[PDB]
Symmetry: C2
Subunit: 358 residues, 2 copies
């Protein structure tokens, strides 16, 4: 009498799929009622479905940190077994339970990146250092207007040089409040802070100008996601390519789209703004089939599909692009770098999309 | 009346294929007389064959820097056209002309890496700085015994700190002459050179201990090879997979070998000696199918086949390994790094295999 489980299943079907496509009308059939459908004949899929739905519920009911880990580990052991004998069992089911298991570990997104930032700059007295920033004569209006990426830099400055040091940059703070980090970043390279700590300062300032954590991404922590794509590939390699019948490829970029995104693919804009290189090129560039793909990853947030484009990405990487990267082509590494950005940032904008407290 | 061309062809068939397998008896049929065979019906292949053979001849007759570039550019334009319409033309031919065009640019290996090294350390008075090393009381016996990788480091020391500075390391030079760079590298970390220039010194010393240019590979120049694998992939992606018939896959690792190299694949030794990590693992490691491949690349020097394993490497990279790298798994990047070593080093040991002067 699993009845708590039936409660969990009800919870899935009624309540968590609309988060999964993230769209009420776009492809609801897949998650609302293809996956539950498959879930019955395959226990790894039911286990994944229950564990994911249970993690989603914990946001409200306290309860069940226990059952999530149970169905987690059931789903994993069974799915490990399920891979080796694909004849006995559907592959759409294996793909589903892949993507679901991903989104589940994605919801355990405990990596809060501000800690990571000061990890990098200094090398407890950690939390509640704000008491003297927003409760401060001149840092209030600037901190009160900033976004979270730039609030981080200002907090980093206070931790380095105290509430009353940061208050000294009258011209820059009037500029940051004024949003011209275009040249507010300019006025900060002439700071005697920047002279005495140039490495920390330069990477703080690009954070203020850009928004993205570009300067710090290379040494970033990011790894709770990574372990789950380790085993996840295991089940891509099993099932690829997918049976002519199986519901997945069609949904796969409307099956590519006769490269319709490529006709103005040159014409889509950076969206990263950091590569800032060669990227005005037309067709005759080995980057396009794979920069167009990144555009498509960036271009849509529907949670399941974004994960789907990731899960399928190594079975679809350009043989001519993979070849460059394997050589060591700088553009290749610097748009695979940009992929570890798209990824790390997608979790940041999903768990920021999701309740944290309050 | 191309008769100089017939001379070139004769030159190919009689004289350059045994360099191409690098083995007189191992697979001579392919190059000695399958490739000439195909060469007649396809002009891109004949053009590549002539251009390659002509570059090989220039080593003796002065003549023809001209005809090499001619057949080069003929082969390229025609091969560009030949790719788009594979129905009209064999794919073994396209693969051949790929590999041959590679080995041709490989023979124009003008990158001499000592210049690259001091590029890195300082940032003309370039050549003939030796006059005061081997013609020097105490540096003679050490320089006279060293190999070329370690002669480079000693020369780097003289350029930094003069003939008579380097002569000061009596204990280390007795040790380097004594070949215990095991701890001769130890005695050099306590040098007041190393104190005043630690960055340059540390990377000099690992060069002395290791042999490989590990410390300097990351900032190395290496690029005359790279451009040719750019377009080379273009013709892998066209022809992959190869027609059930075409002579190539069979030769492809005896078609893999039922993973026979994998049964003691854990058991093959580093050969890099720099990864030095995890590499004692057994099977359950996503690195193996691709570290076993690197072993196989390292394990055989037959020039054509080594190039063949490279040309085919992106159509064969592990989907589970490619997936990690795309994430950013450190082991993945640090054994793709080790691949840009195998590559850069293969040219170094082919053109060192080949006549330079004298």
């Amino acid at each position: 009498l699993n009845l708590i489980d039936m409660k969990l299943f009800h919870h899935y079907c009624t309540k968590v799929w609309p988060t999964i496509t993230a769209a009420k009308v776009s492809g609801p059939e897949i998650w609302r009622d293809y996956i539950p459908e498959l879930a019955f004949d395959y226990p790894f899929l039911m286990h994944a479905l229950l564990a994911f739905s249970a993690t989603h519920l914990s946001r409200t009911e306290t309860g069940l940190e226990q059952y999530v880990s149970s169905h987690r580990l059931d789903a994993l052991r069974l799915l490990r077994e399920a891979v080796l004998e694909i004849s006995e069992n559907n592959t759409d089911a294996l793909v589903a339970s892949a993507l679901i298991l991903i989104m589940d570990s994605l919801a355990n997104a405990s990596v809060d990146n501000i800690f990571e930032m000061l990890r990098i700059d200094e090398g407890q007295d950690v939390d509640a250092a704000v008491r003297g920033i927003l409760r401060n004569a001149k840092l209030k209006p600037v901190y009160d207007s900033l976004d979270a990426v730039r609030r981080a830099a200002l907090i980093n400055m206070v931790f380095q040089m105290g509430e009353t040091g940061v208050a000294g940059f009258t011209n820059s703070l009037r500029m940051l409040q004024q949003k011209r980090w275009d040249e507010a970043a300019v006025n900060l390279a002439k700071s005697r802070w920047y002279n005495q700590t140039p490495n920390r300062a330069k990477r703080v300032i690009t954070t203020f100008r850009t928004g993205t954590w570009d300067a710090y991404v290379d040494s970033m922590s990011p790894s709770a996601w990574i372990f789950h794509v380790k085993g996840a590939a295991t089940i891509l390699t099993a099932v690829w390519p997918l049976s002519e019948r199986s519901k997945f490829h069609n949904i796969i970029s409307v099956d590519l789209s006769d490269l319709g995104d490529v006709i103005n693919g040159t014409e889509l804009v950076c969206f990263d703004e950091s590569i800032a290189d060669l990227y005005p090129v037309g067709l005759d560039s080995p980057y396009l089939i794979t920069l167009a793909y990144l555009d498509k990853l960036h271009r849509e947030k529907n949670q399941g599909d974004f994960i789907l484009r990731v899960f399928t990405f190594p079975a679809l990487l350009d043989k001519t692009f993979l070849a460059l990267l394997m050589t060591g082509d700088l553009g290749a590494m610097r748009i695979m770098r940009s992929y570890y950005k798209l990824l790390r940032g997608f979790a940041t904008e999903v768990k920021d999309k999701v309740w944290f407290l309050e």
